């Protein structure tokens, strides 16, 4: 029931990422000379979070006060000195409440496998690509897939001649 | 957690004042006396048996009907109270449940739904979670409706007798003869030969089941 | 909790008077022990500080010992005259303070009793 | 206690009532019609000769059929009172 | 038990989300308050009789008098409520 | 009843992972020269979790205060010194409540078995593949299956000639 | 009644594991040259669990506080020294409640028996397989069956010529 | 009534274990050259269990605290020393409630008797099997029957020529 809807959601996301990669990889490598497939680890767990933050007021310069009683006594007779300080302070503090409801269906970790073809010249020899072109393909695929390191995304692009 | 003795005595004596209210709105009494109030009308004699006789007969019938409920309350709740194994609060919580079940089984669902909606209560998971504030007036409403149903059904054979006697009187040209006085003794005949009182009380007791 | 709040001041003052009476009686008892310093409490300051202002164990179980959780600044009375045994208890001042404290304890009892009597007379009908 | 049930109850009660009246009413009507036919054939002007034989025939009908109607009506009442607990809704 | 912690996780998860007055409930609360005050006074008096050190006689008597005042207030409120109920239920509708 | 629905859910997930692997393994190895099967250990246990976190306030620099009473007394007569410090502090702390309802049907551990064929040249000799090509196939299968180490995923790709 | 439904559930699970093993064992060993049967010890016991975890706060660095009273007294007359420290601390602790309802029908222990045939060449001699091929079959079967050591899974693959 | 249903349940379980054993023992030993019968000691006793576990907190490092009062006094006059330490601690403990309803109809102890035939060559001499083949049959039967030592399972496979 709901599981099938989630699976179809994942399939559509993967297909659209695949198409976005293919769109940029087509003009330079050529139609059919590139194949990519995407798998997506998604987030279907309902989470609700409330965050409370208090600004520190331990420093007297940023401390906000409402009432303060400072009783000071010094009975000098060091000799028979007698110092007494009774201090009472009531503070008002900065407060920030944030309520967050995470979206259901977010992407947790995306791994993408891309395979490119060789280059057959007018003679027909399948000449492999170069390192610079491979790096360009890797960068383009990283851009298309929305590659990020916090998610833990992995990308692998290899070059091999396609079969007949 | 237990209440003090003074508070327990105060609560007990205060709750002793609600005895007529409890009897009318929680026991069978309401269905019985009302039917009697109609039966004496059907027989054609508003005087009928005296009011006190009917009231006491209804009281005895009510006690006989609630004997199982009273026994269950005595066993589950009041017995630990006397044998010191329960408090007054817990006894009040526990003893009402059989009476709540008895009230619920004779409560029409429509009235219960009406009083829920009118109290804006949340979704009640199941009969067991119905508040007493919602069960009491709904039970009284269903009780009144059932009593009226029984009374109208009772009104039938005497209507048959009145119609037959009036038709016989008019078919003979005796138009100036009031048929009520003639048909009253025949209504008494019908109630005597069929054993109307015993049959009616048996029917009421079976109706509550 | 308004009955507690209304009667709080006089009851707390009465308790403080009882405590100070105990301290004064201890002063009178120790009138002849050498090296003893007479002590007392400032009534006003302690009363205001009580009006302005332990950790028992959690009995989550129904079968364990309730256990126990377990504060007046004692001010030294200034001596009148020096004595060789180092006893600063001047009996004249202590007796005057004892009579004064007993009298004010009785007055506090009278005032609190009048408040309770009026409150109970209001409810009587 | 649906409207269809209440009417099926009323129909049964009216059957019983009419089955109770018909033995008497039919005899009264027959007697009155016969007396009026005789009056028409004899040319008499008095609307009271049709009462005395009518009441006589009514009394004889009661004497003859009283046990039957009494038993039938008592059985109907017994059935109604026995079924009474089970018609409430 | 397992039921209890399910209930407590439910409580926290409603607290996170957030971040009908009944007369019977009020009467029960008032009776519980009267009983609690009486029980506290009785317990303190019992402890004082048993020679407990940290309890004074004046506090015991004052607490007993306060409990008596509270219970008298409860009795009077009950009397007024009963009079009102018996007046209302004596109508001829 | 519900068990059959869960089993069909597992079968669909396994079939889609299989198809994703086959899709990338087809262009280079060839149609039919690759077979893969997937088994999935799934999570059909309803879990509900509420998390509460308090930020530490033991350091006076990050401690947020509402009221503070500091009575200090020094009666110097070290001699007959008498120091007394009564400190009372009421704090306000950061608070974060997170309520999480895990999705039913998540993947716990995925193990995948892939078998590839040999290479029959124009002569017809079944020449086995090379180490580099095997490593490329392993990487592609890891990408397609969403290989992860926290889950405990295991992958095995072997090379052997297919039967007639 | 319910027992028959549980038994049919077990039979379907075993049959699907058998088919998954056969699917990968077919291309290399050959159709009919492999037979496998699966038995499954399942979990039909309804379990409900509630877990409560408290983060330790014994270290003053990670301890969260709401109110703290620290009375310190030092009456120096070591001589007639008199030190007195009355410390009262109220803490707030991290709390995590997890409620788990285990699925009914999970697998407890899976043991699988697989038998393979010999190799009859063009001459017809039933040549037995090799150690490397046997290891490959064992690995493939372990992957297909979802072999795990926490469950206590056992696998046995033997080589023997099939009867006529 | 219910006893007959339980007996039929046992008969079906035994028959299915028998068929599973026969399925693997058929291809190598041959059709009819193997006979097995299974008896099952089952569990038809309704059991309900509630388990409560408390994490130990005797070590101060893992102890979670809510309130702590530590009164320390040292009146030095070893001489007339006077040390006094009043410590009160309120703890919060980890708690795990597990509620388990064991399934009715589980297997307690399974014992299986298997008999195999001799080998009649083309001449017709009933040549007995070998030790290695007998060990293989024992292992296969153990795998098929779900042999376990916690249950107390016993298996006996003997070799003898079948009667006409």
Swiss-Prot record, chains A, F, G, H:
Induction remarks: Inhibited in nutrient-poor medium.
Subcellular location: Cell inner membrane; Bacterial flagellum basal body
Disulfide feature: none
Biased composition (Polar residues): 79-91
Role according to the record: The M ring may be actively involved in energy transduction.
Family named by the database record: Belongs to the FliF family.
Subunit structure, interactors included: The basal body constitutes a major portion of the flagellar organelle and consists of four rings (L,P,S, and M) mounted on a central rod. The M ring is integral to the inner membrane of the cell and may be connected to the flagellar rod via the S ring. The S (supramembrane ring) lies just distal to the M ring. The L and P rings lie in the outer membrane and the periplasmic space, respectively.
Protein name: Flagellar M-ring protein
Encoding gene, per UniProt annotation: fliF
Curated annotation (Swiss-Prot), chain C:
Disruption phenotype: Defects in flagellar assembly process.
Predominant location: other
Lyase keyword on record: no
Organism of derivation: Salmonella typhimurium (strain LT2 / SGSC1412 / ATCC 700720)
Gene Ontology terms: biological process: bacterial-type flagellum-dependent cell motility
Role played: Structural component of flagellum, the bacterial motility apparatus. Part of the rod structure of flagellar basal body.
Record-linked Pfam families: Flg_bb_rod
NCBIfam families xref list: FlgB
Keywords of the record: Bacterial flagellum
PROSITE patterns cross-referenced by the UniProt entry: FLAGELLA_BB_ROD
Domain of life: Bacteria
Protein name per its UniProtKB record: Flagellar basal body rod protein FlgB
Swiss-Prot record, chain D:
Keywords carried by this UniProt record: Bacterial flagellum, Cell inner membrane, Cell membrane, Membrane, Transmembrane, Transmembrane helix
GO cellular component: bacterial-type flagellum basal body; plasma membrane
Keyword Membrane in record: yes
Protein's cellular compartments: Cell inner membrane; Bacterial flagellum basal body
Top-level taxonomic group: Bacteria
Topological type in the membrane: Multi-pass membrane protein
One BP term from GO: bacterial-type flagellum assembly
TM annotation in the entry: 18-38, 55-75
Main location: membrane
Alphabetized Pfam families for the sequence: Bac_export_3 (PF01313)
InterPro entries the UniProt entry points to: Bac_export_3 (IPR002191), FliQ (IPR006305)
Similarity section: Belongs to the FliQ/MopD/SpaQ family.
Record function comment: Required for the assembly of the rivet at the earliest stage of flagellar biosynthesis.
Name of the protein: Flagellar biosynthetic protein FliQ
Organism: Salmonella typhimurium (strain LT2 / SGSC1412 / ATCC 700720)
Curated annotation (Swiss-Prot), chain E:
Protein location: Bacterial flagellum basal body
Transit peptide recorded as keyword: no
GO cellular component, one term: bacterial-type flagellum basal body
Keywords linked to the UniProt accession: Bacterial flagellum
GO-annotated biological processes: bacterial-type flagellum assembly; bacterial-type flagellum-dependent cell motility
GO molecular function: cytoskeletal motor activity; structural molecule activity
Pfam name, any one: FliE
UniProt similarity note: Belongs to the FliE family.
Name of protein: Flagellar hook-basal body complex protein FliE
Organism whose genome encodes this protein: Salmonella typhimurium (strain LT2 / SGSC1412 / ATCC 700720)
């Amino acid at each position: 029931d709901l599981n099938d809807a989630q699976l179809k959601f994942a399939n559509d996301v993967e297909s659209r990422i695949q198409r976005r990669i293919e769109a940029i990889l087509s003009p330079i490598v050529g139609n059919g000379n590139v194949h990519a497939q995407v798998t997506a680890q998604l987030d279907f767990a309902n989470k609700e979070q409330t965050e409370e933050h208090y600004s520190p007021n331990g420093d007297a310069s940023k401390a906000t006060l409402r009432s303060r009683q400072l009783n000071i006594s010094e009975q000098v007779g060091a000799g028979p000195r007698s110092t007494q300080r009774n201090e009472t302070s009531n503070y008002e503090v900065d407060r920030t409440i944030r309520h967050t409801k995470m979206n259901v269906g977010d992407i947790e970790r995306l791994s993408v496998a891309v395979v490119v073809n060789y280059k057959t010249l007018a003679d027909g020899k399948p000449l492999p690509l170069t390192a610079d072109q491979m790096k360009q393909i890797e960068d383009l695929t990283r851009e298309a897939m929305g590659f990020s390191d916090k998610r833990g995304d992995t990308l692998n692009v290899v070059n091999s001649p396609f079969s007949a | 957690q237990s209440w003090s003795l003074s508070v327990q005595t105060l609560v007990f004596i205060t709750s002793l004042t609600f005895l007529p209210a409890i009897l009318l709105m929680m026991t069978s009494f309401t269905r019985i006396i009302i039917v009697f109030g109609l039966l004496r009308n059907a027989l054609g004699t508003p005087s009928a048996p005296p009011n006190q006789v009917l009231l006491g007969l209804a009281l005895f019938l009510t006690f006989f009907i609630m004997s199982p409920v009273i026994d269950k309350i005595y066993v589950d709740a009041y017995q630990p109270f006397s044998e010191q194994k329960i408090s007054m609060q817990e006894a009040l919580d526990k003893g009402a449940q059989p009476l709540r079940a008895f009230m619920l089984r004779q409560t029409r669902e429509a009235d219960l739904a009406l009083f829920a909606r009118l109290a804006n209560s949340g979704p009640l998971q199941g009969p067991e979670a119905v508040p007493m504030r919602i069960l009491l007036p709904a039970y009284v409403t269903s009780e009144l409706k059932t009593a009226f149903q029984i009374g109208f059904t009772i009104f039938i054979p005497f209507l048959i007798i009145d119609l037959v006697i009036a038709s016989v009187l008019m078919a003979l040209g005796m138009m100036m003869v009031p048929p009520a006085t003639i048909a009253l003794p025949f209504k008494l005949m019908l109630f005597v030969l069929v054993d109307g009182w015993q049959l009616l009380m048996g029917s009421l007791a079976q109706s509550f089941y | 909790d308004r009955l507690d709040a209304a009667l709080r001041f006089q009851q707390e003052a009465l308790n403080l008077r009882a405590q100070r009476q105990e301290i004064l009686a201890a002063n009178i008892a120790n009138a002849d022990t050498p090296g003893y310093q007479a002590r007392d409490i400032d009534f006003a300051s302690e009363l205001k500080k009580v009006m302005v202002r332990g950790v028992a164990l959690t009995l989550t179980s129904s079968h364990h010992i309730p256990a126990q959780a377990v504060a007046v600044d004692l001010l030294y009375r200034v001596p009148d005259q020096p004595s060789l045994d180092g006893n600063t208890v001047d009996m004249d001042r202590e007796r005057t303070q004892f009579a004064d404290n007993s009298l004010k304890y009785q007055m506090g009892l009278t005032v609190l009793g009048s408040q309770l009597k009026g409150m109970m007379n209001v409810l009587q009908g | 206690m649906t409207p269809e049930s209440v009417m099926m109850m009323g129909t049964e009660a009216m059957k019983v009532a009419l089955a109770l009246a018909a033995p008497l009413l039919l005899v009264a009507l027959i007697t009155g019609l016969i007396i009026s036919i005789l009056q028409a054939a004899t040319q008499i002007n008095e609307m009271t000769l049709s009462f005395i034989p009518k009441i006589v025939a009514v009394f004889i009908a009661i004497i003859v059929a009283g046990p039957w109607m009494l038993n039938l009506l008592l059985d109907y009442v017994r059935t109604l009172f026995s079924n009474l607990p089970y018609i409430i809704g | 038990a397992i039921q209890g912690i399910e209930g407590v996780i439910s409580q926290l998860q409603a607290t996170a989300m957030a971040a009908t007055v009944s007369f019977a409930g009020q009467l029960h609360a008032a009776l519980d308050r009267i009983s609690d005050r009486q029980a506290a006074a009785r317990v303190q008096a019992e402890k004082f009789t048993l020679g407990e050190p940290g309890i004074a006689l004046n506090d015991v008597m004052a607490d007993m008098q306060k409990a008596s005042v509270s219970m008298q207030m409860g009795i009077q409120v009950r009397n007024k409520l009963v009079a009102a109920y018996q007046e209302v239920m004596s109508m001829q509708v």
